Symmetry: D3
Subunit: 249 residues, 6 copies
């Protein structure tokens, strides 16, 4: 494999234009350690410039998507350093989870095969589209660990899940399954685990057929237009269209 052995906590496999990105700490339910965060920044920067990768799928090894932030590894790394290390460690989490990922140049799909807890909600929603297994379990367990949702988790909910349901799951920390995730709008679809890869693959190959520059303008302009008024968007959306026409040539 082009990327075999390159990262310790992540695996990347290219197949016919699809970059399958697997969070790969299965014994730790792919908990996002500071090492995983630095490696995932490198994965996204590398795949952005890899002409053979037209779409990214973000999935988890084993029975986990990600259980969220790795408590042990964060604090061993923070407590060993001055205050300023926490600022860098948070930036590294943000950098892959949404600063590069949410407005990524290439289309992105979360393939949620299992556990998706806490911090995993940020990259889940930064990913453009999402398919889960029926068998997947989700939760915002932060409240039961004595922290409010950290990083962009609460905004990830605010963008995808209705006000009342967002507050219910944030406030109670109750778990929910793949069907509920799809019903609430957190993902596009929930399917049996045995059909997850094929469902994700057909969507990925659909996106691969689109003009990349046009798809980028369309998906990323939509995300930004949510934040702008109609008068502001007249200007912004026509600028993205004209920008698309320049960069396609």
């Amino acid at each position: 494999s082009k990327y075999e052995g390159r990262w310790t906590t992540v695996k990347v496999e290219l197949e016919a234009g699809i970059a399958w990105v697997t969070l790969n700490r299965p014994e730790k339910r792919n908990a996002m350690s500071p090492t995983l965060n630095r490696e995932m920044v490198d994965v996204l920067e590398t795949l952005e410039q890899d002409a053979d990768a037209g779409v990214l799928v973000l999935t988890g090894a084993g029975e986990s998507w990600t259980a969220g932030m790795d408590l042990k590894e964060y604090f061993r790394e923070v407590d060993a350093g001055p205050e300023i290390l926490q600022e860098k460690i948070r930036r590294e989490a943000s950098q892959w989870q949404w600063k590069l990922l949410r407005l990524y140049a290439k289309p992105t799909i979360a393939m949620v095969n299992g556990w998706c807890f806490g911090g995993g909600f940020s990259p889940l929603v930064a990913c453009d589209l999402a398919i889960c297994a029926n068998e997947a379990t989700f939760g915002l367990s932060e409240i039961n660990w004595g922290i409010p949702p950290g990083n962009l988790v609460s905004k990830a909910m605010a963008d995808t899940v209705g006000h009342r349901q967002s507050l219910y799951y944030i406030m109670t920390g109750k778990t929910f399954d793949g069907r509920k995730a799809a019903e609430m709008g957190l993902v596009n679809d929930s399917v049996p685990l045995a059909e997850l890869r094929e469902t994700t693959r057909e969507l990925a190959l659909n996106l691969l057929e689109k003009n990349p520059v046009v798809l980028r303008a369309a998906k990323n302009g939509f995300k930004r237009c949510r934040e702008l008024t109609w008068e502001q968007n007249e200007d912004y959306l026509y600028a993205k269209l004209d920008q698309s026409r320049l960069l396609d040539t």
Copy 2:
């Protein structure tokens, strides 16, 4: 008819306070040409001052609502002119599609009888309310034509359709039927085509019974309140209420 023969690409029929506005280029699936855009600006300005029109219904001739922007006619008109003509042609599209229509002084209803593609999404969502036929087909085909959604189409989606579904339909360009449109929140209701006119008419006549000044304050204040904080809205919404009381007298 009061408005018979007045416009070449649009028909207007008044019935008991209802202004039935028909996009009328059926052989071209009511594609929005620059002529249609200029005529629809004139229709909205004329009907605003017509005391006999209390509610507007926007519908399409034949099996089409609108197939979106008329490619042929736009480019024949643009390429024949200097750069500055494109700015005017875009303003004319915006002017009827949402600058006058979204915060129109009178209540508006889209009666979606058939095809609704691409550019049609802007006036669809500018219209206050919408009823479609089950038999209607919708799509954001722009991505498959090699352009991101132009004008206010992506914002029209952002205001009515959940994040994940909006991105799915923008990114894939997949079509969806009237039932899906209603399920996603793009329209208020989907009914059999044979019940579309009657369903629309009963809603229109309901709106006609309301105090016009109060209905205007209520519908347009709602659309603006979405953009404002709660503290800002305390001020704005009480100002709209007091404004209503002045202008009703």
Copy 3:
């Protein structure tokens, strides 16, 4: 009872950490008079500092939650005074309905036992969570009384109910039942009236188990994050997390 006889238009009963707050003008369907507004400001300020109250439930006496603003009492009080009294009376309505309530230090639940009309929508949505009876009837009757929705009612809808449904109910003034309220996202759940208290109580006791400072950061940070960009929220949400850690100690 600790609070027996203390307020003329409201009753408060503490049970094992639950502050049951009952709007108590049943013969007037708990219409919100200026007296009720001043008393409810005092209830919220008092309960904020009552160590024995960990969660608030807002409910209505009799077959009513609240029928909305008390027309008779508002105008008897306004017309008897100079212009400046209307500014004070509106501030008092806002103060309890959402300025204290929406970002209240303690978790809040609306227990909607019956009629919820017009002005009641503001505290309904300021409350974090909401359970209604199937038997409850809701409506935005303002349009049929010749006023647009006053105070924060239209924003309360904008935050919880989809664009098309919000406009339909604001523009038509049509009533809807508890099941529809839950379907549209106005409340978290609709249950038979005979199960309303128990459903509300189990949710309240769930919230009581959480660390109060953490629950406050989580629920109130979510409401504020809706208003902020992702870049702004990186800063704000980590500040709320760090603030939580300081104030928990």
Copy 4:
């Protein structure tokens, strides 16, 4: 001349690529009546498509720039008609004063020769740049007439004049001269009335030296970027740059 006798309340002189637009009701201090608003919409739409006009200068006939709204002619039109006529009249005022003018495709300069009161503040600030005479007199007289500022007047102030000075002039309705207008940022520069036209003409000719599509992207993108965050602007301002490159 090209536009002679075309409009009853406005004069247009085109020379060397400069469209000199003169508000032309001198005996009424160029008060903005509903007729002047409709004619000014037509003027801006006409000049936008005039390939021989590269820059617009907005000025007043006589000792006035504009005294603001023509109360008499506004109330004659509104009180005549149904409630809904006021919606159209307000929209016509907004249409020329800033909906077309603030983000106009061509560079715009206000040349403030004299009185500039109330409603005149909206097009004053919609204009990209502004030079006034020292002899010009400004005021937000609305408060003394018993109305708060209408249309976009208060926002025109908020965009150009500091919070304290804006509130002082809105609340007191006191007048200020050209030098004070320049000191507060309401205009680029205050010069003697004797030098106003020549100073304005030199600026207009400088702007005509620029690539029109590029100048449009630069000026109108600046106005919009004020409303957007840095992260939003990374996207928006690169999109305007790439749009310029396509349209040039």
Copy 5:
């Protein structure tokens, strides 16, 4: 007098429609304790409904306007009680300093006679207009005490003082005098202390000449319009005008 001995930390003198509100802990530089915050909420609510008060002037007893938060009395109240007492104490500070004061129904003027430090910046900017003595001394001393500015102090700066100057005074904690306050836009004007009261009184009497409902719409609409786009403001500012017409 009408309000004699009513409040322990504040004095109110009413004359000729002017409510002179004096922060009254001179020996403690009028430091804002929790008691002064609760009394100031009561003062503003009381004066709002006082038909004989048309304009408020906020000033300080002695050589101080306000030194800012009373650290000693704040920490005595908070450290005594549960965590939740701090929420109430912060809310009381906000309630008078800007939640009631910034968009107060009556015109407001800060009359800055002396020291104005830290927390005093919030009500300073909430007040519509402000005149200071040249002899007044200002500072954001928070940085030298080991806290960033609390409550709305940093936003008070952001609304009135340029980015660079705000950051310089926040980051360094250096003091500045009345002339520098006026130069930066923190106040309308700096005048000699000998002329401060008479200058303030003349301004207050000018504001009393205005229609109170119209003045309220004009001043408070201006503050809000800063937050809204031009398109939003077309709707909002016409709604405030029509609201004025109804309420007048």
Copy 6:
């Protein structure tokens, strides 16, 4: 020295807790090439974790601060590669110029010794504070090169320079000197070039006297509070204060 020969286009001198960062392509007026952008990302990340650097000063070698983008080296890299290389190149420019720099954990000062054109405006304004020489010359030359300002240049102007002056300098591309930069608020102060370094050093040492965590909360909270309403800021600015107290 600690950072000798580490970067090809940048020099870092650490002394007395001050990291003097010199853009170091003097013969090319310190033009910002893609290599300088990548090295400047590394410089800021390196210095953030350097416990011996408490304050950063950004300056230029030779008679330039920075002439702005290196057109030649940018177009050599982009035109070589696929479309997607331009995304990475723009991101690298943004990364050091403001994504790391505007809300940097340590206090930052721009020390503008000479030419500051076009793209240089982004890091100029990202820097917390700025002092220039009187002899420094500024310009937004983009318009004369046929591009609107790219990256965050127009927003840098919008945050620091009044609407009218911003538009004048963007639309005309005319140059201005150090005194005009200070007058417009683009910088804190303009001093003679002979006194620039010593003035900058005294400011840097003042900032080093502050609690670093508190200073970070104060400066970066101020920049953010500009974007938020008063009600939003009551929440945000108290959260930054409580966050400071935890992290100190």
